[PDB]
Design a protein. Sequence first.
Lengths: 139, 139, 138, 138
Amino acid sequence: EKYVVTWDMLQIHARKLAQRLLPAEQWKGIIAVSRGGLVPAGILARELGIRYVDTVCISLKVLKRAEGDGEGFIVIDDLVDTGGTATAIREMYPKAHFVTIFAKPAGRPLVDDYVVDIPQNTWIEQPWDMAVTFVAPLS
Amino acid sequence: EKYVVTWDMLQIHARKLAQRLLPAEQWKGIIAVSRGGLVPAGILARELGIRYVDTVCISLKVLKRAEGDGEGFIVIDDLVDTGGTATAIREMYPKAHFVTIFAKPAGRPLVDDYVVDIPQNTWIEQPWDMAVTFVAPLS
Amino acid sequence: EKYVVTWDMLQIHARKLAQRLLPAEQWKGIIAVSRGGLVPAGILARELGIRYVDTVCIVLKRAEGDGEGFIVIDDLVDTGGTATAIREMYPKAHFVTIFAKPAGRPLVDDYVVDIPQNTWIEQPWDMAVTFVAPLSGK
Amino acid sequence: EKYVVTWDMLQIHARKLAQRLLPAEQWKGIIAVSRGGLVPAGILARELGIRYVDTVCIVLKRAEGDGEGFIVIDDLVDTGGTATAIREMYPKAHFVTIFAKPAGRPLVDDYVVDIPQNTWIEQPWDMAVTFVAPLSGK
């Protein structure tokens, strides 16, 4: 099964998460989990008026990481699935508020907050993977 | 609580419903429940190659109705909520295959098929009610 | 070069048409030309508060009468063949389209967007968000 | 007249830029200019298969080094003030933007869409699908 995510709906969910993160003055910055958290981080940064945005990039190999234990930061990823990355991010940024747009059951309790529940066996098709394209009639 | 529906996602769900209605040759036509079923009916008509599209318009007042008992027709509405319209449509078109995009719990068993479950206390905001508009930052 | 219509652009055009059709109270209803008129009729029906929506399917099926007090809506007037049939059977309807090409534009009462006769046009119901492979597979 | 960028148009432009940046293998990473560069960087990172994405926040925070082997991306070069700071601290980066106005266009290595200096531009992260009352309340 597929769960399709359009740009406008990703933004609806990210703005709903931003509303939950008010007031903005409680936060020092946002750390995006690359790559999935980049677009959500841009939306949160806009809504919260936060210009201090950093990244964490992991494959376990750390390609690049934001310094510190996450105190006063939001850490955002697009999805928590099995929770592999999530377990590592908690360990690296134990004082951050860790949030995602989507959560599958296995990696629901590994984040502090998320917007939308997705079943475990469903592939989430994010809008950066798609284009509006002619489709032949199903007939 | 709100459930926002964009044009692209309405179309994703309607194309998924059309796939379930294959093969197209089993159907004589589509009857749209006005107004909500008009856009879904246009998408099904395109996907199934069906040019015989009619309407049923109810407020109980019948403004206009398609003739017959629905044999070989799909009857489509956008949502089944409490099931008021749905009870009347079954009664008027008892041989139709009655389908919706969305179903709330109260009016899930009043249709033959639907795509997406919506909680009873959630207002569905359809894309014909919205425009892409500047929004002030939440901050 | 393909002229691609998005859902949101179609709705912008249909709302511009709806504004011209005010006051809404003057209309008995809307007749959609199947299939291209169905989505534009849905938008007009929302904007004008009109629940009486019927269809004409070219004749497979038609709304009765001469069209007096009705809006008849299509997506596009191209060659004018459909338009010719609509003016014949609904001579007193207000016949409108979202898009018009020159060959057919004399046959409609109003349109929103004119396009060149040669335009290759695709409507939003012909397209969908679809996976596309990344430009690099690395 | 407002120049409104949709999400899907921004992605079309960013994919056109990504194609110019092939082969992807030549890059160490992407540096996003916060905040306007974050969404374009996400799209480039997908299209180019690049997981090393860093940020510069004007200095609140910066990616280290002189930029050699990096793409630096912003949404818009307007007056050129940010661009001036980026060429100073990342002189060996390939500095690109989606949109450019003339005042700033000499300061970037590449851009996709030029617009007039006076353009009132709104990006997709400034807008959202929002209820609007029907034109008739009937």
